[PDB]
Design a protein around this nucleic acid. Structure first.
Lengths: 56, 117, 151, 55
RNA sequence: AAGGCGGCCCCCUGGACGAAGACUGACGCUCAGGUGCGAAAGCGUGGGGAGCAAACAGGAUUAGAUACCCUGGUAGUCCACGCCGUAAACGAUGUCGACUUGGAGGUUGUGCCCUUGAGGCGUGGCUUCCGGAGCUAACGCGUUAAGUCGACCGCCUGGGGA
């Protein structure tokens, strides 16, 4: 999520672009996912539940 | 206390606190300020306002160095990720780059156990 | 009001000066529906608070209100299991209401002889940026500055 | 016919941070997606591609 | 086969599937006892030990808190070789074979056609969801049956005691 503030752009648009890039990279979701241990059965059950609810 | 005009703003945005450290291009720290050291303890410490005032006080700890253009390296999931950047830009600083350097292990060490709260 | 959107009642202007501010001040100072008793107090206080300064009456009253009017106050909130105090911006009508209520409670908490004298002294203190009404306004602003992080 | 030496083609299937893009985004077959993942890992080993945007 | 298996590379190696043929000619299915494999924890010997973390210590919370929460932390988790032989070892559904309307997908071969196209049309293997007859106490299963049958095996006979 490297953001180089190019010329003739205000700071606010650069900050919003940085946020958009860091959310499309998914770094916050990953660092929130990795802070506690999730058992293999727990992650398998969660993936199965997510795949089941992705049917509508 | 000489003139740098080229710095880096290392923001350590943890869940419980926010640490802002302004170093030169090489990595030698010139000044630092935290949310807990700015008059905020407990619930007020993990807020974007505390991170903002910490970035304000850290920008004052480097006024003797005369920094004009400085980089931003955000690290951590906690609040104050963008609040410190806004407080640094408002302090008369030319933000040249913003970079997320949050450490991501490629499935390395085992994290602690889940909290049964 | 769970669903009730409510209008506004017609407050009559002051008989002596023709101000709605003074009418609401008399309403706030009134007890037991004794409007004639409160109007005499307010008029005596405004007269006594007129010769002292020199800017008539209504002007002195507004000058006293300007120093007691709070810009921001805290609202208690129970979200994180503890006392959250979010500083909210006060509306102008609520601003005047708070200022007048504080001035009245400060004048009633005085040791002068009559309520007219207490009011005159409280308003003169407020114009001089001192007293217990200004004290309460600074207390509120202090409490808001302390919890600014919770906006 | 996916070759780990074809960095010009491999760079189309990695993000700006060097991570492999999922097959749902590019709509490539599962078989050729597996071949692409193997080729990208091999090219990362040969230092032809970056592991991350840091290093 | 199950338990399980997740960076990349090399060496050894098992099974499955498909196309067109050639070959043997019932050589098959199931299987008490028997043997082998069998998550995690645990045990023995010798290593290793970053992170995590039974036991343990302290700080909290509480009426108490030998717990949840916090700060540490030993065995263990890791490797080699043996033992253990148990799991909600689950599809709570033994294996093998035949027959019975469909729909949408996934994955992996193969064939045909100005291949128009990342195309269309067939034909196998495995696999996910819905659903028809039928079956079921119902829930539901439904060509991967819990439908209609055949072969063999294991098991059940009220709840506790157990």
């Amino acid at each position: 999520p490297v953001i180089k503030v190019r010329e003739n752009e205000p700071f606010d648009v650069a900050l919003r672009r940085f946020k958009r890039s860091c959310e499309k990279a998914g770094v916050l979701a990953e660092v929130r996912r990795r802070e506690f241990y999730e058992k293999p059965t727990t992650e398998r059950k969660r993936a199965k539940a997510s795949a089941v609810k992705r049917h509508a | 206390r000489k003139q740098v005009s080229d710095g880096v703003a290392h923001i350590h945005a943890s869940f419980n606190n926010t640490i802002v450290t302004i170093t030169d291009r090489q990595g030698n720290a010139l000044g630092w300020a935290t949310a807990g050291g700015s008059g905020f303890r407990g619930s007020r410490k993990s807020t974007p306002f505390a991170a903002q005032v910490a970035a304000e006080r850290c920008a004052d700890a480097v006024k003797e160095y005369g920094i004009k253009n400085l980089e931003v390296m955000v690290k951590g999931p906690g609040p104050g990720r963008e609040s410190t950047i806004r407080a640094l830009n408002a302090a008369g600083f030319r933000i040249t780059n913003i970079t997320d350097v949050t450490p991501i292990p490629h499935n390395g060490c085992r994290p602690p156990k889940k909290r049964r709260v | 009001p769970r669903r009730r959107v409510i209008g506004q009642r017609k407050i009559l202007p002051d008989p002596k000066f023709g101000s709605e501010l003074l009418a609401k001040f008399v309403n706030i100072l009134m007890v037991d529906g004794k409007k004639s008793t409160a109007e005499s107090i307010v008029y005596s206080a405004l007269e006594t608070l007129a010769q002292r300064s020199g800017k008539s009456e209504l002007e002195a009253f507004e000058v006293a209100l300007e120093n007691v009017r709070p810009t921001v106050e805290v609202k208690s909130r129970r979200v994180g299991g503890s006392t959250y105090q979010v500083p909210v911006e006060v509306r102008p009508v609520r601003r005047n209401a708070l200022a007048m209520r504080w001035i009245v409670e400060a004048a009633r908490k005085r040791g002068d002889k009559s309520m007219a004298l207490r009011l005159a002294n409280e308003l003169s203190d407020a114009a001089e940026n001192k007293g217990t009404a200004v004290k309460k306004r600074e207390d509120v602003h202090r409490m808001a500055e302390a919890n600014k992080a919770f906006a | 016919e996916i070759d780990y030496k074809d960095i010009a083609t491999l760079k189309n299937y990695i993000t700006e941070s060097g991570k492999i893009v999922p097959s749902r985004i590019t709509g490539t077959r599962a078989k050729y997606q597996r071949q692409l993942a193997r080729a990208i890992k091999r090219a990362r080993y040969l230092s032809l591609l970056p592991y991350t945007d840091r290093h």
